[PDB]
Amino acid sequence: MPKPQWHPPWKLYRVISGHLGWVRCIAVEPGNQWFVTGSADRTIKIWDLASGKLKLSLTGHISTVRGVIVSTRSPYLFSCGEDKQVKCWDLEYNKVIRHYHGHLSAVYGLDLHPTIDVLVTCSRDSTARIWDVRTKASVHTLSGHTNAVATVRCQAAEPQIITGSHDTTIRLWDLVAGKTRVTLTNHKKSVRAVVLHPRHYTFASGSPDNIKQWKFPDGSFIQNLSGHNAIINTLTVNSDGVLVSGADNGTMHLWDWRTGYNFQRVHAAVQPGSLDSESGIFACAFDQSESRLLTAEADKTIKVYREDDTATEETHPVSW
Amino acid sequence: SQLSKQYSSRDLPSHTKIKYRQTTQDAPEEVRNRDFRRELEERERAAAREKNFKVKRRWDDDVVFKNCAKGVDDQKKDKRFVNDTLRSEFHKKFMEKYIK
Amino acid sequence: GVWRNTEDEILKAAVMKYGKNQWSRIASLLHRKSAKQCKARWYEWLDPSIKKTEWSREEEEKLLHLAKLMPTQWRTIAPIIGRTAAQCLEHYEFLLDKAA
Amino acid sequence: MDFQHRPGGKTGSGGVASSSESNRDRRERLRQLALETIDINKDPYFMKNHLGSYECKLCLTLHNNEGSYLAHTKHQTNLARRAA
Amino acid sequence: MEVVLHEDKKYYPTAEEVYGPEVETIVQEEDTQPLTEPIIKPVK
Amino acid sequence: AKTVTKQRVESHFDLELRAAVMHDILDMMPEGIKQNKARTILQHLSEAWRCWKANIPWKVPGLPTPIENMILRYVKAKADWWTNTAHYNRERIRRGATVDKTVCKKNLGRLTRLYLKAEQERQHNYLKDGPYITAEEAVAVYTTTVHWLESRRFSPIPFPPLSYKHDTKLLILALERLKEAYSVKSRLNQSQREELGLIEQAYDNPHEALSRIKRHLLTQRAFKEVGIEFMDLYSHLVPVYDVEPLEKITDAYLDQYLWYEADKRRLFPPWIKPADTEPPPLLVYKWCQGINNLQDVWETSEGECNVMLESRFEKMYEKIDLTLLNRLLRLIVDHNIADYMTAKNNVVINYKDMNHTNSYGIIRGLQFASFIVQYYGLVMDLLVLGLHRASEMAGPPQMPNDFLSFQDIATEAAHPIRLFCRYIDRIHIFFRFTADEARDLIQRYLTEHPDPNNENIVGYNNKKCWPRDARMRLMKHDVNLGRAVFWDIKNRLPRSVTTVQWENSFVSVYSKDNPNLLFNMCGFECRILPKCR
Amino acid sequence: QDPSYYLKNTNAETRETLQELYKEFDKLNAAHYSTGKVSASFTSTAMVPETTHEAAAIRYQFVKKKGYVRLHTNKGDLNLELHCDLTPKTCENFIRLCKKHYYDGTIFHRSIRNFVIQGGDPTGTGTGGESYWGKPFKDEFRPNLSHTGRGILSMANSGPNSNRSQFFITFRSCAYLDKKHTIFGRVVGGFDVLTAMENVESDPKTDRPKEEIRIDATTVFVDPYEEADAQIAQERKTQLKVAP
Amino acid sequence: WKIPPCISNWKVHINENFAKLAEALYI
C-alpha cells in the first residue's frame, strides 16, 4: 500500500462570460497563444489566452457545435456540429473550405490522428466515421456500439481508436481493418469521457459508476478509482499526473494518476443570474504549458483555474 | 458504398491539397523546443501591465421637486452579465426599442 | 346573454370532458354561445372553486379594509379575499347599505 | 400567386353543408354527451321510449329533451317516495 | 428604502461578490478584430 | 442522409433536444426501477415548456429533484434559444431582408408572449413591492392640482343628466365613431356581426341605451376581460385592445359627453395639442410663426440665447397609479364617474393563454383614454412649467389666451421659458436666456457634474439629415448650455412619475455662434435662419 | 436622505398631512421530491424568482407496525390492535386515549345490532373523548385494514377529523363505517368478548349499549403510536444533547 | 424514484405602503 505523492491543489483566478449558449467544448492553440470555445450558441469564439479578450467569433453551424479542434501541424480548424456536419476552416482566409457530410445523425465528437492526419467522428447514430481530410471521404465507418458514441480518442499508439459510448462499453479498435479488437463491459454506467496518459501507455474512463484505469493494448484493467461518482462528462490529465475529473454537477475532483488518490474536491460557483441547475462541466482542458485549467461550465462561463502555489505538504496533507 | 454511380456537385474533386504549419505558423518542430510556461507568464505580465423696488424669485423656483438627477448613473450595471434572458439588459433594451 | 340550466349543465359536462383549455370545442356544442362567453360563465359563475358561501367576520373586515384603503379595484381585491369580483362588490355594497 | 400560403382547402372534399345538418350533428353530440353522463352515473332511472323519448322511472316522468331529464335530478322526492 | 423602482429592479449580486474579488471577472463580448484579419497570419 | 435545411430546423432541434433528454435521463438511474417512465418524463417536460410558454406556474410536487433540475436546465436552454431566435428574426425583419409571412407571424407571437410575460412581471412586482410613486410627492402633486383647479375657477363636470338636451346628438357622434370601423361591409365574423347588431339596436332605441349607459355609470364597476393583439410596423409593434361592444358603446358616448363638457367648461387650455382647430402642418406653421413674431428674438448680441427643446415623456403610461388617478378624478368629475374610470382599467389582459389583470398600466383601447392622457399631460405641464408660469401662459380664466398669444412682451420675458407646445407627450419649449443666467445654469450643472476633460461636447445628439453647414456648431459653451438646460428640466420631474431621455430629446441653441435653430415638429424637420444672419 | 430632499415649495396642508401621517405612524425532514415553488417561479413571471431548489419537509407519526391495547371491557380483557400503518391518526387517538384515560376508565360509546360496538370513549356518545392533539384526530379508512370483517377496530366518527377516542370493533363487514371512520385495525384478543359486546342489548336511538363494554383499564401490551412518540422524543433528544 | 403520472391541462401578499399612501391621500 504505497503512500501517494502530493500534487499541489488549484485555485480559480479568472472567469470568462459572454456566451449566450452553453460552452460545449474548449480547444487551445498548440503554440499556447490563444484558445477557442465552441458553444451551444453555435458560436466558435477565439479568445486570448493572456488578456482573455474576445479575439473573434464565428457562426455557420446550423445546430449546436459539439466539437472544436485546431490541427497541430496544419493551419486548419475542424468543428463538428449537431447538424450532422463537420466544417474544415482555413484560418488564413477564416472560411469553411471543406465539408464532411455523411453521418446519419448528430455528431457528438471528433478526433484527428497526430501523424497520419485522418479524421474520426463519433455521432448519435451509434457509429463513428473515419474521413480523409483533403477529399472529405469517409473511408471507414466504425460500428458495433449499440448506443450513441459519446467520445473518441485517436492516438498514434496501439490501439489507435478508443470509443466510449453510452451502452456501458468501451471499444478499442484496430485501425487498419477498421475493426474493434477489445470491448470492455466493466463500467456499470455510460462511458462519457476517456483520457489517455501521454507517456505511460495507459488510459482512464469516467462514468457515473466509477473511474477505471486500464493499460494499452489489450485494455488490461489496472485500477478502479471510486469517488466523484456523478455523470462525468469530461476528463483531463496533466504531465505531472494531476487528473482532473469534471462531471455534470459542476464539481472538479483532482487525483494522482498513479495511486488514484483524490487530493482535491472543489465545487465552483455559478453566474449571478443563473439557476443552481446551471452548473455542469462540458470540457476540462489544461493549457499547453500545463499550468492553467479551462472548465466549460453550464452557466455559459469558462472558468480558468491557476495552481494553488502557496500550498505545502503539511498545509495540504496526503491522506493515507 | 463501392458501387454507387451518382455524383453530387459537392462530391467533385476540390481543395485537394493540405497546407501545413510553417515556422511562422507555430510548426511542431518549434512547439517541442519551445516551452509555453514562461511565454504564458510574460504574456500575462504584459496583459497586467497594459490593463492600466420689486424682486422676484429664482425663475426655476416655481417647481415642486429639486435635483432629481442625483443618483442616476449607469456605469457597470449594464455591464453586469445577467445570464437570464428574462432579466437580460439587452433584452430589456430590445423590448423598449421594438415595442411602442 | 341568457343562461339556461340546460346550457349550464352542458357547459359543466363539456368542461369535465374537454378539460379547461378547449373552448371553441365547447362553443361548438353550445349554440349561440361564444368561447369568451363560455369562459366567463364558467370561471365567473360555474367554477366549483368559486367560494359560493357567506362572508365571515374576517372576510367582511378584510373586504371593508381593502375597499376603504385602495378604492374600487375588485379584480385586485377578490384574489386577496378568495371571492370573485361580483361577490366582493355586491357584499361591499351590502355592507355600505348596512352602514347607511 | 402564393401557392404555399393559400387557405386550407383540399380537392374532393364537398364543402360546408347546410346549418340543419350541423344542428342535428350538434344534437347528436349532445346526445352522446348525455349518454356519457348517464353511463358515468350508471342510473337505471333513465330509459329510452319506443318513440325515442326519455323516461324517468324514479318519477315516471316524460322528457322530450335530454336537458329536461338532466334538470330532473322534484326528482329526489319521488325517488324517496318510490324507495319506501 | 424610498421604494426601488422597476426601471432598475436590480436582482442578483455582482460577479466579484459571487466569485470573490481575487478572481479576474472577464465580462468580455464582441470581437477585438474584424473577420478580415487572419488568425495565424500567412507568410508574405 | 438529407441536409437539415430551413424547413427542418425546429423539428431536428427538438429531436436532438429530446435525444439529449434521453441520454441525460438514462444515467442517474440506479439498479432496479422497472417503471422508468421516460414517456411520463417527456410529458412532464412538455407540460413544463407549455406552461412556460403560457406563463403558468408549473409544479409537480411528485418529481425527483435532479430530474427536476435537468428539466429546468433544458427548459432554460430552449427558452434562451427561443428568445435569441426571436431577437435575430426581429432584427432581420426590421432590416427587411427576410420576406416570409409565417416567420413574421411566428415572430409576432413570440414577441407578444415575451412582452406579456414582462408585463405580468411588472404588475406582480408593482403589487408586491408597493407603490413606486412614494407618498409625499403624490400628495404635493395633488395639492398643486387642487391649487390650480381653484385658480382656474373650474366648475366640475357632473354626472350626466337623465334628460340632456343634446344626448341624442352626442349618441349620433358616438355612433359615427363606432360605425367608422365597420364601414367596409366585409364578410366579418360572428362577433363583428353581433357588434353591428348591437350598434343597430342602439340606433333604433336611443333612450334605453342612454338609460343603460347611466345605469352602468352608476352601478357597473365589474367589466369583461379585454383581448389584446398587435400590428407590426416593421420597426415596432403597436397593441390593439378588444373590449365588449356594449362597454365600447358606453365609453364612446361617455367620451363624447365628457369632451363636450370639457369644451363647455373650457377645461383644456389651448397650449395642449392636437387641437381640433388646425391640421398639424398648420400647427407647424403656427409654432414657426410664433417663434418668428417674438420681439428681439434673433438678436443674440448680449448672450440672450435661443434654446429649442423637443423631448418626450417616455414612461407616461405604465407608471399611472390608479388610486392616485381615482383621487385626481374625484376632483374633476363625479365620484361614480371616477370609480368607473378606476374600475375600467382594472380588467384582465388576455391573449390566448395570456391572462393577467392590468392594475398599474393604462389601456389605450378606452375611448376616454385620449382625454385622460391629455389631462395627465396637462398636469405634467403644471408640474414642469409651474402654476405662475402656467397662469402667464393661459392668462386669466375669464379671458383666456390662444395657443400663442400672451398679455405682453414683459409677460414673455418675465421668465426665460417663452413658448410652449405639448403634442400629447412630445414637448417643444422655446427659451430665451440671458448670458448671466445661462452662465449660472452652466455653473450649477458643472457643480453637480464636473468635467475637467470637457467631454460634454461629444455626448450631443444632432440632426444628421441636414448638411454640416446646416448643423448647429458644437463648441463647449452652447453644448454645455443645452446640457445645463436639460439638466434643469430633468431636475424638476421625479423619476417616480416619468423620465425624459437625453437620447430622445433634441436641444438646439441659436446664438451669435450658431445662426440656425433646428427642430422637428411631427414629421417636419424645420431649420430657422434669420435674414439678419 | 431627507424627506424634503428632492422637494421644494412645500405646501402648508401638505405639511400637516405629513405631520398627521408621522403622528399616526432537517435531519428526518428530507423528502427528496422538492418544493414546487422553484419550478413554478421558473415557469411563470407572477412570483419571486427562485434559483436554489428547495426540498419538501415531512415526523408524520414515524411508528413501528401496530400496537395492541388490552382494554378491560365489561365482557372481559379484550385486546384491540390499532395499526399506525393503516391509520396513524387513529392509532395516535387510541394510544392517547389509553394513556390519558379517555379509553381506560371509560364506557362503551355505541353499539349497533350486531354491526359495530364502539368503546373506549369518555363521552359515551359515539365519537367523544380525547385524541393526541387535544382535538379529534383525522379520520381516514385504509384499504389494507378497512372497516370490514370481524373484530375490526375503527376509530368511530361521524366524518373526517372527528375521531377522538371511540374505537368501533365491527362484528360484520359494512360500508357505512368505510371512508367515514378511521379504521385503526382489528381486535387481537378477546374476540368472543367483543362478539358478545356487539350482540349485547343496545338502544338504537343513539345506537348505544345498555350492557356497555366499559374499558376500566387499558394495558398497552404493544403501542405503535407511543412507539412513534418515543422515537420522536429520541430523535429530539439525540440533537438536544448538543443543542438543548 | 417513483414517478407520478403527468396530467395535462391541455389534454398573495400586498405591501402596506399602498395603505400608507392611501391614508395620506385621504388626509
PDB file of C-alpha atoms in Angstrom, chain G residues 52-155:
ATOM      1  CA  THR G  52     -31.931  27.458  -5.399  1.00  0.00           C
ATOM      2  CA  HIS G  53     -34.005  24.277  -5.401  1.00  0.00           C
ATOM      3  CA  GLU G  54     -35.800  23.723  -2.088  1.00  0.00           C
ATOM      4  CA  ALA G  55     -36.638  20.310  -0.647  1.00  0.00           C
ATOM      5  CA  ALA G  56     -40.030  19.432   0.800  1.00  0.00           C
ATOM      6  CA  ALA G  57     -40.372  18.836   4.531  1.00  0.00           C
ATOM      7  CA  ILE G  58     -42.105  15.858   6.128  1.00  0.00           C
ATOM      8  CA  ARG G  59     -42.362  13.443  11.861  1.00  0.00           C
ATOM      9  CA  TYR G  60     -45.734  12.333  10.408  1.00  0.00           C
ATOM     10  CA  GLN G  61     -46.064   9.592  13.093  1.00  0.00           C
ATOM     11  CA  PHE G  62     -42.914   7.589  12.400  1.00  0.00           C
ATOM     12  CA  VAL G  63     -44.212   4.403  14.000  1.00  0.00           C
ATOM     13  CA  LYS G  64     -43.257   0.721  14.177  1.00  0.00           C
ATOM     14  CA  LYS G  65     -46.052  -1.550  12.808  1.00  0.00           C
ATOM     15  CA  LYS G  66     -49.177  -1.952  15.012  1.00  0.00           C
ATOM     16  CA  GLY G  67     -49.931  -1.595  18.709  1.00  0.00           C
ATOM     17  CA  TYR G  68     -52.187  -3.705  20.920  1.00  0.00           C
ATOM     18  CA  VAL G  69     -54.087  -2.362  23.931  1.00  0.00           C
ATOM     19  CA  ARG G  70     -55.851  -4.886  26.167  1.00  0.00           C
ATOM     20  CA  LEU G  71     -58.914  -2.921  27.203  1.00  0.00           C
ATOM     21  CA  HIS G  72     -60.599  -4.406  30.281  1.00  0.00           C
ATOM     22  CA  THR G  73     -64.121  -4.073  28.921  1.00  0.00           C
ATOM     23  CA  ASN G  74     -67.238  -5.333  30.709  1.00  0.00           C
ATOM     24  CA  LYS G  75     -67.219  -8.513  28.602  1.00  0.00           C
ATOM     25  CA  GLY G  76     -63.593  -9.178  29.563  1.00  0.00           C
ATOM     26  CA  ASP G  77     -59.997  -8.236  28.841  1.00  0.00           C
ATOM     27  CA  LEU G  78     -60.297  -7.762  25.078  1.00  0.00           C
ATOM     28  CA  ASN G  79     -57.123  -6.846  23.184  1.00  0.00           C
ATOM     29  CA  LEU G  80     -57.707  -4.384  20.337  1.00  0.00           C
ATOM     30  CA  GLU G  81     -54.827  -3.728  17.942  1.00  0.00           C
ATOM     31  CA  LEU G  82     -54.608  -0.325  16.256  1.00  0.00           C
ATOM     32  CA  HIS G  83     -52.343  -0.149  13.204  1.00  0.00           C
ATOM     33  CA  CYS G  84     -50.492   3.103  12.600  1.00  0.00           C
ATOM     34  CA  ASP G  85     -49.563   1.789   9.150  1.00  0.00           C
ATOM     35  CA  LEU G  86     -53.294   1.642   8.422  1.00  0.00           C
ATOM     36  CA  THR G  87     -54.252   4.890  10.160  1.00  0.00           C
ATOM     37  CA  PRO G  88     -51.633   6.737  12.253  1.00  0.00           C
ATOM     38  CA  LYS G  89     -54.105   9.414  13.391  1.00  0.00           C
ATOM     39  CA  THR G  90     -56.456   6.687  14.661  1.00  0.00           C
ATOM     40  CA  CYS G  91     -53.519   4.946  16.357  1.00  0.00           C
ATOM     41  CA  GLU G  92     -52.479   8.261  17.960  1.00  0.00           C
ATOM     42  CA  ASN G  93     -56.067   8.858  19.123  1.00  0.00           C
ATOM     43  CA  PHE G  94     -56.418   5.348  20.593  1.00  0.00           C
ATOM     44  CA  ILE G  95     -52.978   5.367  22.260  1.00  0.00           C
ATOM     45  CA  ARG G  96     -53.563   8.851  23.696  1.00  0.00           C
ATOM     46  CA  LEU G  97     -56.965   7.703  24.980  1.00  0.00           C
ATOM     47  CA  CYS G  98     -55.328   4.649  26.586  1.00  0.00           C
ATOM     48  CA  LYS G  99     -52.589   6.820  28.121  1.00  0.00           C
ATOM     49  CA  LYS G 100     -54.673   9.798  29.329  1.00  0.00           C
ATOM     50  CA  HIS G 101     -57.690   7.638  30.353  1.00  0.00           C
ATOM     51  CA  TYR G 102     -60.115   8.683  27.628  1.00  0.00           C
ATOM     52  CA  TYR G 103     -60.355   4.923  26.970  1.00  0.00           C
ATOM     53  CA  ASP G 104     -59.236   3.496  30.323  1.00  0.00           C
ATOM     54  CA  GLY G 105     -61.972   4.150  32.859  1.00  0.00           C
ATOM     55  CA  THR G 106     -64.453   4.863  30.061  1.00  0.00           C
ATOM     56  CA  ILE G 107     -67.703   3.276  28.927  1.00  0.00           C
ATOM     57  CA  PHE G 108     -68.830   1.955  25.548  1.00  0.00           C
ATOM     58  CA  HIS G 109     -69.798   4.830  23.274  1.00  0.00           C
ATOM     59  CA  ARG G 110     -72.058   2.919  20.889  1.00  0.00           C
ATOM     60  CA  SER G 111     -73.395  -0.476  19.811  1.00  0.00           C
ATOM     61  CA  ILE G 112     -75.383  -1.361  16.708  1.00  0.00           C
ATOM     62  CA  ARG G 113     -77.462  -4.512  16.214  1.00  0.00           C
ATOM     63  CA  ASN G 114     -74.565  -6.954  15.569  1.00  0.00           C
ATOM     64  CA  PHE G 115     -72.796  -4.445  13.299  1.00  0.00           C
ATOM     65  CA  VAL G 116     -70.236  -2.431  15.317  1.00  0.00           C
ATOM     66  CA  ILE G 117     -69.523  -1.802  19.005  1.00  0.00           C
ATOM     67  CA  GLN G 118     -67.697   1.431  19.874  1.00  0.00           C
ATOM     68  CA  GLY G 119     -65.916   1.534  23.222  1.00  0.00           C
ATOM     69  CA  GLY G 120     -63.179   3.477  24.935  1.00  0.00           C
ATOM     70  CA  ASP G 121     -64.751   6.942  24.784  1.00  0.00           C
ATOM     71  CA  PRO G 122     -65.175   9.082  27.920  1.00  0.00           C
ATOM     72  CA  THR G 123     -68.172  10.960  26.495  1.00  0.00           C
ATOM     73  CA  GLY G 124     -70.054   7.780  25.597  1.00  0.00           C
ATOM     74  CA  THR G 125     -71.831   9.334  22.604  1.00  0.00           C
ATOM     75  CA  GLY G 126     -70.132   7.681  19.618  1.00  0.00           C
ATOM     76  CA  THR G 127     -67.183   9.906  18.717  1.00  0.00           C
ATOM     77  CA  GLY G 128     -66.204  11.538  22.023  1.00  0.00           C
ATOM     78  CA  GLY G 129     -63.029  11.569  24.063  1.00  0.00           C
ATOM     79  CA  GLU G 130     -59.538  12.925  23.504  1.00  0.00           C
ATOM     80  CA  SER G 131     -57.076  12.294  20.678  1.00  0.00           C
ATOM     81  CA  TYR G 132     -53.334  13.031  20.590  1.00  0.00           C
ATOM     82  CA  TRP G 133     -53.656  16.682  19.517  1.00  0.00           C
ATOM     83  CA  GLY G 134     -56.376  17.558  22.040  1.00  0.00           C
ATOM     84  CA  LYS G 135     -58.868  17.995  19.230  1.00  0.00           C
ATOM     85  CA  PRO G 136     -60.047  14.825  17.453  1.00  0.00           C
ATOM     86  CA  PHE G 137     -57.674  13.168  15.008  1.00  0.00           C
ATOM     87  CA  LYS G 138     -58.150  12.934  11.249  1.00  0.00           C
ATOM     88  CA  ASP G 139     -60.499  10.201  10.034  1.00  0.00           C
ATOM     89  CA  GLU G 140     -59.429   8.121   7.030  1.00  0.00           C
ATOM     90  CA  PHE G 141     -60.071   4.440   6.298  1.00  0.00           C
ATOM     91  CA  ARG G 142     -57.161   2.376   4.995  1.00  0.00           C
ATOM     92  CA  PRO G 143     -57.537  -0.099   2.112  1.00  0.00           C
ATOM     93  CA  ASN G 144     -55.301  -2.756   3.664  1.00  0.00           C
ATOM     94  CA  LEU G 145     -57.125  -2.608   7.021  1.00  0.00           C
ATOM     95  CA  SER G 146     -60.653  -1.341   6.358  1.00  0.00           C
ATOM     96  CA  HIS G 147     -63.899  -1.423   8.362  1.00  0.00           C
ATOM     97  CA  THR G 148     -64.762  -4.949   7.236  1.00  0.00           C
ATOM     98  CA  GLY G 149     -64.617  -8.374   8.844  1.00  0.00           C
ATOM     99  CA  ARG G 150     -64.974  -9.491  12.441  1.00  0.00           C
ATOM    100  CA  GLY G 151     -63.419  -7.568  15.312  1.00  0.00           C
ATOM    101  CA  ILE G 152     -62.144  -4.804  13.018  1.00  0.00           C
ATOM    102  CA  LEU G 153     -61.465  -1.851  15.332  1.00  0.00           C
ATOM    103  CA  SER G 154     -62.181   1.534  13.735  1.00  0.00           C
ATOM    104  CA  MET G 155     -61.838   4.977  15.327  1.00  0.00           C
TER     105      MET G 155
END
